[PDB]
C-alpha cells in the first residue's frame, strides 16, 4: 500500500514516529514533521525547517545528507524509514558527490576504507586529485573547447560535390529559414548565410542538430558530418538550430635485491574453511610465474587429511634465488584434493608490492574456487592477484614470506637497471627467416636472444617475439632486455595492442604499449574501448598506466567517459573486478560532475525498468499478453515510474534525448526473458522524432555487444576504403548484472513475419513504390553482402528468418548473435530468396549477381588486410571469459576464416570456391519445403 511509518530523530533528542506517503518528496515531509513537532516537547529550541537537512542510511549502508528535497521518499529508498535532522554545515559539495558516487557505481565508498589497504588509499588520493584538477582546468576554458569535450563531432570515416537545401532556425524562435548550400560548404559558411538572412559576429554561434546534442563546428565540410551524410542519402532535408556562445556557457556553468643469492621460499602454514571429501587427502601445489612462463619447476605440500582447517606448517623451497625474481613475479597456489584429481580452489600473489618492496611476513590469501576447463591445467597463472572479497565464507591459505634481510628491500630503480643492462651476412639469414613471412622453438629462442641488438635495429615490429624469448628467471637477461626497451622505437597502434596481452606482464612493456597508443584519435580509441577495459583484469596493481590513460581520455572526451563508465559499471557485480572497477568509477565521477547528473538519471530509469520487467516476467506466466501489457502501462503511469523513465539522455547515445515515454506504444517481446520494448518521442525532425529501446534482463548481452562492435569495426574499415555496405550497427550496451539496452531499428520486421514466392520482393514494392524500388534492391544487395561476409568471418551460425530483419529502406541486418567462432566451421551461406531479390525477381541476372559477388569479395579482401587487428582485439577479449572466446583455437578460427596463412590471391580463390558451393547449396536447401 502507499503509506510507510517513518522514525524522525530531532537534534534536541526528541523522537517522532508517524506515517507518510511513499510518493511524498522530502520538502513535503519536512512540513508534516514541523506541523507535528510543535505538539511535542522542546519545539521552541529548534531553528526553522530550512536550517536542517535530512540524514538517512541508504541501501549501500552509508549516511546520506538529502540536500535535494524535491525527491520522493521512495526514490531515496533509505535502508529503514529513519530520518535524522542535522545542521547544514561543513563542505556540502564534498558530502553530496561522495553520496552520489556510492549510489551511482553500485558499491559504497566506505567499503574501500574498511579494507585498511594503503594501495587503495593511495589510488583514491592520487587519482581523485588528478581527475578533480583536469575538471577544474576544464571549467576555465572557452565554450568551444567545452563543446569539443561535451559533444565531440560525429563524422563519417572520410576523416561527391552536390548541393542541397537545409532548414535553419534560432534559439527561442518559431520562424525558420530554408536555403540551398553545397555538400562541400564548411559549417561557418552556413552560419554566416542564416545571420545575413535574419538581418535582411557569426563565429559566436554553433549549429545544433535539433532534438539532439549533436553539434556542427570546426574545419570540416557538411557531407563529412553523420547527420548531413544520413540526410543526403535518405534525400530528407536536414533541420538545424543556431545557438549563441553564451547559451553554451549556460551549460558549462549549470640493501640491494641482486645481493640476495639465497633461494626463494615460503612457509605454507594452514588452510581454512575447506569443503572437501572426508575420505580424500588435501595437497597445495605451488609455482612461480611471470605472465604465462613458469620461472622454475613447481613444488608440492605433503598429503594432509581432508578437513575444514588443514595444517601443513611446511616449508616450500623453489629452484630460483631471490636475486632472480622479476618485478612482476607471481606466486600461484591451487588446493587439490587427492585419493591415497580434484582442483578445489586457487590464489595468486605478487611477490613485490605496489611500492616495489619485496613482501615479508604472514599473508592470508582468500582463494577462488577452481572451474574444470578443457585445458585442465594444474595452476591458474592468468588468474587475478586480488583476494576474494567473500572474506567470511571463502576458503583461505595462511602462508609466511620469510624475513630475508634486516633492512627492507626494493626491486632496483630504473637507473640501476640501465647500469647492469648497458655493458653488452651469415646470422642475418636465420633471423630474417625466423621473424619474416608464431610460437618459436628453443633453438630459435637463443638465436633471437643473441641477435637481440639486431632485432631492435632491423625488426623493431618483432619486439613481442623478443620479449617472450627473454629468460625472465635471470635478472641479467631482464636487465639487458629492459635496456633495449627504453631505446626501442615507437611501434604502430596494431603492434602496441599485442603488447597489452597477459604474455607481457612487465610494467615497462605496458608503459611502452600505452606510449604507442597515445596517438589514437578519440574515434579510433572508441573502436577498441571494450578490449582496453577487459585488459585491466590482467593488471597486477591498481595504479597502472592503462588506468591513467583511460581516465585521461575519459576526462578529455565526454562520449569516451560515458562508455568507459558503462563498461566498468556493468561488471560491478563481478567480485574479481568490483574493487578495481569501483575505484576507477569514483575517480572518473570526481572529474565528471556534469555527466554524473546524466548517469544518475540513466541509473534510475534502469532501476525502474528492472522492477518493471520483473512485474511483466511474473504476469506473463499468470495471464495472457493484452492484460499483462495493460498492467505494465498502469505501473509505468505512476508519478515516480513515469518521471524516472522520462527526460533522460539515451545510455546508448548520450546525444539522443529520450524525452516523453509513449506508454500505449510500450510493450514487451515474446522471447524467454520478456525484454521490454519502450517507445519515446523527441523534438527531432522525422524518422528520429520517434526512437525505441529494448531493456533486456536475464541474458548475457556481452556476446552480442562484441559481435556488433566487430560489425561496426568492419563497416568503418569498409567505409574507410570507399565501400558503404549499408550496414545497421545498432547500439548494444551492458548496464548491469545480466542487464542492458538494445537500440530498436524502427521500420524493420523479421523475414518470417514479412513472409505471411516474391513475398520479400512485394514487401519492398509496398515500402518503395514506383521509382524508389531500385534503391531498396541496392540497399538489400549491399547489406546482404556485408552480413554474408561478416557472419562467415566471425563464424556466426544459426542464421534464420526469425533472427534476420529487413528495413523498409531495403537494408538487411541480423539480430540475437547467440553464437560465434563456430560455437565445426560455419560455411559461407547464400539464401536463395536473397539471391532472388538481388537478381530483381529474375531466374537469371548475371550483370547484377556479379556486382553482389564483387561486394562480398572486395569486403572479404579489406578484412584480410586488417586481420591482425581482429586477432589482437580477439586475443585481449579472452580476458572477458566469454564461453565462446576462451582459447587459442577460438582465435585460430579467425586466422582460418580470413585465411591469413595464405597469400591474397590464394585466399580469394578459396573464398570463390566457398561462394560457388554456397550458391549450389542455395538451390538444394530451397527445393525442400511445402
Amino acid at each position: 500500500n502507499q503509506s510507510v511509518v517513518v522514525d524522525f530523530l530531532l537534534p534536541t533528542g526528541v523522537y517522532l514516529n508517524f506515517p507518510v506517503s511513499r510518493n511524498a518528496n522530502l520538502s513535503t515531509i519536512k512540513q508534516l514533521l514541523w506541523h507535528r513537532a510543535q505538539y511535542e516537547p522542546l519545539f521552541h529550541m529548534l531553528s526553522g525547517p530550512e536550517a536542517y537537512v535530512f540524514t538517512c542510511i541508504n541501501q549501500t549502508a552509508e549516511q546520506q545528507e538529502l540536500e535535494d528535497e524535491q525527491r520522493r521518499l521512495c526514490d531515496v529508498q533509505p535502508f529503514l524509514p529513519v530520518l535524522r535532522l542535522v545542521a547544514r554545515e561543513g563542505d556540502r559539495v564534498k558530502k553530496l558527490i561522495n553520496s552520489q558516487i556510492s549510489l551511482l557505481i553500485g558499491k559504497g565508498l566506505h567499503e574501500f576504507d574498511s579494507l585498511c589497504d594503503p594501495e587503495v588509499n593511495d589510488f583514491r588520493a592520487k587519482m581523485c586529485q588528478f581527475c578533480e584538477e583536469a575538471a577544474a582546468r576544464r571549467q576555465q576554458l572557452g565554450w568551444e573547447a567545452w563543446l569539443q569535450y561535451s559533444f565531440p563531432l560525429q563524422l563519417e570515416p572520410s576523416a561527391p560535390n552536390r548541393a542541397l537545401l537545409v532548414n535553419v532556425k534560432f534559439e527561442g524562435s518559431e520562424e525558420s529559414f530554408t536555403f540551398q548550400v553545397s555538400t562541400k560548404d564548411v559549417p561557418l559558411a552556413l552560419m554566416a548565410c542564416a545571420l545575413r538572412k535574419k538581418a535582411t559576429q557569426p563565429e559566436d554561434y554553433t549549429l545544433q542538430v535539433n532534438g539532439r546534442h549533436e553539434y556542427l563546428y570546426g574545419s570540416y565540410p557538411l557531407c563529412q558530418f553523420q547527420y548531413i551524410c544520413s540526410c543526403l542519402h535518405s534525400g530528407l532535408t536536414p533541420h538545424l538550430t543556431m545557438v549563441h556562445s553564451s547559451s553554451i556557457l549556460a551549460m558549462r556553468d549549470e640493501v640491494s635485491l641482486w645481493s640476495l643469492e639465497q633461494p626463494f621460499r615460503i612457509e605454507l602454514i594452514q588452510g581454512s574453511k575447506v569443503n572437501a571429501d572426508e575420505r580424500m587427502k588435501l595437497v597445495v601445489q605451488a609455482g612461480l610465474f611471470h605472465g604465462n612462463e613458469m620461472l622454475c619447476k613447481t613444488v608440492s605440500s605433503s598429503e594432509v587429511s581432508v578437513c575444514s582447517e588443514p595444517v601443513w606448517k611446511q616449508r616450500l623451497e623453489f629452484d630460483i634465488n631471490i636475486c632472480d625474481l622479476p618485478r612482476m613475479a607471481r606466486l600461484c597456489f591451487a588446493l587439490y584434493a587427492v585419493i591415497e584429481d580434484c582442483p578445489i580452489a586457487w590464489a595468486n600473489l605478487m611477490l613485490f608490492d605496489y611500492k616495489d618492496q619485496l613482501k615479508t611476513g604472514e599473508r592470508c590469501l582468500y582463494m577462488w574456487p577452481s572451474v574444470p576447463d578443457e585445458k585442465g591445467e594444474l595452476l591458474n597463472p592468468t588468474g587475478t592477484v586480488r583476494s576474494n572479497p567473500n572474506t567470511d565464507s571463502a576458503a583461505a591459505l595462511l602462508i609466511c614470506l620469510p624475513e630475508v634481510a634486516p633492512h627492507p628491500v626494493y626491486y632496483p630503480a630504473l637507473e640501476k637497471i640501465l647500469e647492469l643492462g648497458r655493458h653488452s651476412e651469415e646470422e642475418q639469414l636465420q633471423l630474417r627467416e625466423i621473424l619474416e613471412r608464431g610460437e618459436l622453438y628453443e633453438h630459435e629462442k637463443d638465436l633471437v636472444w643473441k641477435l637481440r641488438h639486431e632485432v631492435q635495429e632491423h625488426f623493431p615490429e618483432a619486439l613481442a617475439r623478443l620479449l617472450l624469448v627473454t629468460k625472465w628467471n635471470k635478472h641479467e637477461d631482464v636487465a639487458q632486455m629492459l635496456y633495449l626497451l627504453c631505446s626501442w622505437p615507437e611501434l604502430p597502434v596494431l603492434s602496441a595492442l599485442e603488447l597489452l596481452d597477459f604474455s607481457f606482464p612487465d610494467c615497462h612493456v605496458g608503459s611502452f604499449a600505452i606510449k604507442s597508443l597515445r596517438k589514437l584519435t578519440d574515434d579510433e580509441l572508441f573502436q577498441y574501448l571494450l578490449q582496453l577495459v577487459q585488459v585491466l583484469k590482467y593488471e597486477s596493481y591498481l595504479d597502472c598506466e592503462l588506468t591513467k590513460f583511460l581516465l585521461d581520455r575519459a576526462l578529455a572526451n565526454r562520449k569516451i567517459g560515458h562508455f568507459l563508465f558503462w563498461h566498468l559499471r556493468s561488471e560491478m557485480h563481478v567480485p574479481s573486478v568490483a574493487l578495481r572497477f569501483g575505484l576507477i568509477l569514483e575517480a572518473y565521477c570526481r572529474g565528471s560532475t556534469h555527466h554524473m547528473k546524466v548517469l544518475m538519471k540513466q541509473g534510475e530509469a534502469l532501476s525502474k525498468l528492472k522492477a518493471l520487467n520483473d512485474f511483466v516476467k511474473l504476469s506473463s506466466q499468470k495471464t495472457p499478453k493484452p492484460q499483462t501489457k495493460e498492467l505494465m502501462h498502469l505501473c509505468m503511469r505512476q508519478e515516480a515510474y513515469l518521471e524516472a523513465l522520462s527526460h533522460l539522455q539515451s545510455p546508448l547515445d548520450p546525444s539522443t534525448l529520450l524525452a516523453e515515454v509513449c506508454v500505449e506504444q510500450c510493450t514487451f517481446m515474446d522471447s524467454k526473458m520478456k525484454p521490454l520494448w519502450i517507445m519515446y518521442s523527441n523534438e527531432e525532425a522525422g524518422s528520429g522524432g520517434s526512437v525505441g529501446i529494448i531493456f533486456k534482463n536475464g541474458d548475457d548481452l556481452r556476446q552480442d555487444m562484441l559481435t556488433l562492435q566487430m560489425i561496426q569495426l568492419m563497416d568503418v574499415l569498409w567505409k574507410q576504403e570507399g565501400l558503404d555496405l549499408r550496414m545497421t550497427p545498432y547500439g548494444c550496451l551492458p548496464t548491469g548484472d545480466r542487464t542492458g539496452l538494445i537500440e530498436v531499428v524502427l521500420r524493420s520486421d523479421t523475414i518470417a513475419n514479412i513472409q505471411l514466392k516474391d513475398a520479400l520482393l512485394n514487401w519492398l514494392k509496398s515500402k518503395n513504390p514506383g521509382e524508389a524500388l531500385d534503391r531498396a534492391i541496392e540497399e538489400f544487395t549491399l547489406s546482404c553482402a556485408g552480413y554474408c561476409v561478416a557472419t562467415y568471418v566471425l563464424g556466426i551460425g544459426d542464421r534464420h528468418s526469425d533472427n534476420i530483419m529487413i528495413r523498409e529502406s531495403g537494408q538487411l541486418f541480423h539480430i540475437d548473435f547467440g553464437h560465434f567462432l563456430g560455437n565445426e566451421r560455419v560455411p559461407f551461406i547464400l539464401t536463395y530468396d536473397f539471391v532472388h531479390v538481388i537478381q530483381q525477381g529474375k531466374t537469371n541476372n548475371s550483370e547484377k549477381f556479379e556486382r553482389f559477388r564483387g561486394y562480398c569479395e572486395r569486403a572479404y579482401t579489406i578484412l584480410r588486410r586488417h586481420g591482425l587487428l581482429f586477432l589482437h582485439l580477439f586475443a585481449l577479449m579472452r580476458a572477458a571469459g566469454l564461453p565462446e572466446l576462451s582459447c587459442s583455437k577460438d582465435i585460430q578460427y579467425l586466422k582460418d576464416s580470413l585465411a591469413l596463412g595464405k597469400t591474397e590471391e590464394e585466399a580469394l580463390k578459396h573464398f570463390r570456391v566457398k561462394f560457388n558451393e554456397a550458391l549450389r547449396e542455395s538451390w538444394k536447401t530451397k527445393v525442400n519445403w511445402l
Binding site: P41, I57, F79, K273, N275
Partner: protein
C-alpha cells in the same frame, strides 16, 4: 616394446559423452547457486552494516537526549514537561530494541546462508573428479576411434 570393436567403442563414446554432458549441466546448476548465494550473502553483509549504521545514529540520539535534557531539565515547577521528555525518550529506547531484534534476525539468516554456501562448494568439489574423469574418458575414446580411422560423420552422430 611401446606399452574391442569400433561399434562397441562408439557405443561407449555415446554413453560417456551423454554422462559427461549431464554431469556438466549438473555442475553448471551448482555454479549458478554458488554465484547467486555469493551475491545474496554480500547483500546481507551490507544490510547488516546498514543496521549497525542505523543503530549508531539512534545511540547518538540517546547521547544527545541525555546531554541536552539534563542541562535544561533543572527547570522544575513543570513536572509535566519532564514526563513528556522522559516518555518520548522511553519511546526512542523501545524502538532501538525492535531494530536490534531485526538485525539479529538477519544475522541468523546469513549464518544459515553461509552454511548453504559451504555445502554448494562441498557438493561442487565432490562432482569435479567425476566431471574431469568423464571428460578425459570421452577424449580417450575419440582419440582411439580417430586413430582407427573412423570418419568424422560417425563420430558426430555418437556425440548427440
Amino acid at each position: 616394446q611401446q606399452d574391442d570393436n569400433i561399434e562397441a567403442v562408439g557405443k561407449k563414446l555415446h554413453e560417456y559423452n551423454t554422462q559427461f554432458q549431464e554431469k556438466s549441466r549438473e555442475y553448471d546448476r551448482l555454479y549458478e547457486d554458488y554465484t547467486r548465494t555469493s551475491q545474496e550473502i554480500q547483500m546481507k553483509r551490507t544490510a547488516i552494516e546498514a543496521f549497525n549504521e542505523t543503530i549508531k545514529i539512534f545511540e547518538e540520539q540517546c547521547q544527545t537526549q541525555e546531554r541536552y535534557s539534563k542541562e535544561y531539565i533543572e527547570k522544575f515547577g513543570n513536572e509535566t514537561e519532564i514526563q513528556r521528555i522522559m516518555h518520548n525518550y522511553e519511546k526512542l529506547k523501545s524502538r532501538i530494541s525492535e531494530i536490534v531484534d531485526s538485525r539479529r534476525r538477519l544475522e541468523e539468516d546469513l549464518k544459515k546462508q553461509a552454511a548453504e554456501y559451504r555445502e554448494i562448494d562441498k557438493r561442487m568439489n565432490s562432482i569435479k573428479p567425476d566431471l574431469i574423469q568423464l571428460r578425459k574418458t570421452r577424449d580417450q575414446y575419440l582419440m582411439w576411434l580417430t586413430q582407427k580411422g573412423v570418419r568424422q560423420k560417425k563420430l558426430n552422430e555418437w556425440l548427440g
